[PDB]
Amino acid sequence: LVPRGSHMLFQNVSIAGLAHIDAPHTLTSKEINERLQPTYDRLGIKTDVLGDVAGIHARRLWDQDVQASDAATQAARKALIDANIGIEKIGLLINTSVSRDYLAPSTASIVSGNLGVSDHCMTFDVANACLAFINGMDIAARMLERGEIDYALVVDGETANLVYEKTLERMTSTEEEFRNELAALTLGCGAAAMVMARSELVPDAPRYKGGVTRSATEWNKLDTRLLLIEGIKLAQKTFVAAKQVLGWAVEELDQFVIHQVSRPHTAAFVKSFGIDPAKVMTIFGEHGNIGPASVPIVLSKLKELGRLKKGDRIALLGIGSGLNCSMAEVVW
Amino acid sequence: LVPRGSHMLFQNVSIAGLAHIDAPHTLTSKEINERLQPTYDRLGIKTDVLGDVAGIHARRLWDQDVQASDAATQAARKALIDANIGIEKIGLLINTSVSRDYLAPSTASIVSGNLGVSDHCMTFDVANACLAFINGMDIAARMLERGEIDYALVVDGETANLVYEKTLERMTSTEEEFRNELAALTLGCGAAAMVMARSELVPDAPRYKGGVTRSATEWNKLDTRLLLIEGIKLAQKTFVAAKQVLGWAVEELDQFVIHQVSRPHTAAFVKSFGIDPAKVMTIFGEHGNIGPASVPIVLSKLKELGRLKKGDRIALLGIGSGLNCSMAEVVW
Ligand SMILES: C/C=C/C/C=C/CCC(=O)[C@@H](O)CC(N)=O
Ligand SMILES: C/C=C/C/C=C/CCC(=O)[C@@H](O)CC(N)=O
Ligand SMILES: [Mn+2]
Ligand SMILES: [Mn+2]
Secondary structure, X not given: OOOOHHHHOOOOEEEEEEEEEEOOEEEEHHHHXXXXXXXXXXXXXXXXXXXXXXXXXXXXXOOOOOOHHHHHHHHHHHHHHHHOOOHXXXXXXXXXXXXXXXXXXXXXXXXHHHHOOOOOOEEEEEEEOEOHHHHHXXXXXXXXXXXXXXXXXXXXXXXXHHHHHHHHHHOOOOHHHHHHHHHHHHEOOEEEEEEEEEHHHOOOXXXXXXXXXXXXXXXXXXXXXXXXHHHHHHHHHHHHHHHHHHOOOHHHOOEEEEOOOOHHHHHHHHHHOOOOHHHEOOOHHHHOEOHHHHHHHHHHHHHHOOOOOOOOEEEEEEEEOOOEEEEEEEEO | OOOOHHHHOOOXXXXXXXXXXXXXXXXXXXXXXXXXXXXXXXXXXXXXXXXXXXXXXXXXXXXXXXXXXXXXXXHHHHHHHHHXXXXXXXXXXXXXXXXOOOOXXXXXXXXXXXXXXXXXXXXXXXEEOXXXXXHHHHHHHHHHHHOOOOEEEEEEEEOOHHHHHHHHHHOOOOHHHHHHHHHHHHEOOEEEEEEEEEHHHOOOOOEEEEEEEEEOHHHOOOOOHHHHHHHHHXXXXXXXXXXXXXXXOHHHOOEEEEOOOOHHHHHHHHHHOOOOHHHEOOOHHHHOEOHHHHHHHHHHHHHXXXXXXXXXXXXXXXXXXXXXXXXXXXXX
């Protein structure tokens, strides 16, 4: 009768399986810089912007012309293994990548066809910059909770190679334009997939509780000074919302799985919220920003390291273009 | 305890408001054909493929460089008026268009910012070719049903002008390639938006019951002979599913609001299912295929014509690239 925060949380939604794919090829910021040197020289800019301002030592790239759907499909096969279920069990497949094979059909229908889903399997893409994998989790969770389905896949493959190819070409003949282009050189490749399920079908798997979103769509035109200040302001509001629904206090969370934009942005965020940096696994310095796949890759890598115990409270969160901010909880 | 079809239907989800935007400019197939004549002549093809095979007399185009987000925003303003609510009430805004301003941020965040949504408003894009507006309705419905929100916007703006510009340029210097390009000349421009709400907040508005999806993702590579046969096979399965959940028999539905691909595809569909053509409003011959906006535009135009009575059972359905097929019901 009387609303309470906890009411909107999911009771019956679990994480059956989880996997990631590291893209194989290392591209160092040192090697990029040699290609950019002569235009560093010409513009008169003596600063290693990627290595010294962003904090990226390297990113991963695909070795071949991998489509988003291929990377997602690889990750999905691994996640099904992790969940020990066959594709016939999946009732929903949501693709959340920024990378996209086509305008139509959906990347999800391409991945679904690759995997061999059944005729009952609903499929579509969600796009929301860096936050879409959490949005896909929540969309799937609602359907699991209600019982419309028993198992869902949420998949995300990202490819940056053609971005890099083109960006590096376009900054080897203006400072204003050239500084805009440096930011694409912090992106990386990779994939992730998650099998979600109804909790009773999967007794004692990790629980997805759901979470909260706040937005500042007034800022949909985004600098980087401004992405940062407005982004932190938005996160603050969002943490209030998380307190009100999830009961969050920063000190009670065991791990923060955080979308990563750059070394200084992350530092600023963790400082502003008094987060312990030891609870913030980071892959940005050697993998770059994997867009919406960053959050589930980091979760999967935490899992694989044996970094988690039954009961551990894991915060999934990011700030995305929009601006949007989403915060959700997994209890391992 | 025992599942029944009706269980998954939404009980508490209504349609508060609905609007569409007709794009202003008429472009006749006669005028296109004069531009294509000399390449009709060169390839030796004497058939009016657009006028005589597709059945499109004209399509609507924008007069100016309208972005999808602008068209969606226009439609959304009209829908809020139709619902007699201000933007502050909206808790969710989903954009479903194929047309898209950017890779990031979402088109939805751009529309949200234009409208002035509150900081509590969740936003994202769903992409699923021609069926995404029904997918967006259902995603919103789940959140309305559970009470996470009270009012949602589902918006869709489409623009084909740059498609036309480029396609007409690219077929005025191979038959195989040229026939592939004729199909883009059946697309049209337009927009639609829908305000959904919790039924008690909106006593006696149209009810959204939800619906069903079946898929044939084996066919994500799609001819047109094959789009048709496999598409009808898929629709047949989907109608079985609709029977099992919604209780559908074709003769008990009052109106069929059907995504439209072409005159012969529609004819084939309606024949194959024994549908009465008088219950199938069509705008394709003068507006062309508006992609995922086609279904809500047709619904809105039915509304505006005074074509609906309290209690009327309206079938929303389409076949989309994937292949996917979705079928849902509104009770006016
Ligand atoms: C901590 C503050 C961060 C400011 C936000 C920047 C937006 C980041 C990006 O551009 C992408 O990496 C993620 C995204 N945009 O959705
Ligand atoms: C009635 C049979 C139809 C065959 C399906 C064709 C796909 C149609 C399209 O290409 C678009 O108009 C709609 C869509 N593809 O999602
Ligand atoms: Mn290599
Ligand atoms: Mn005009």
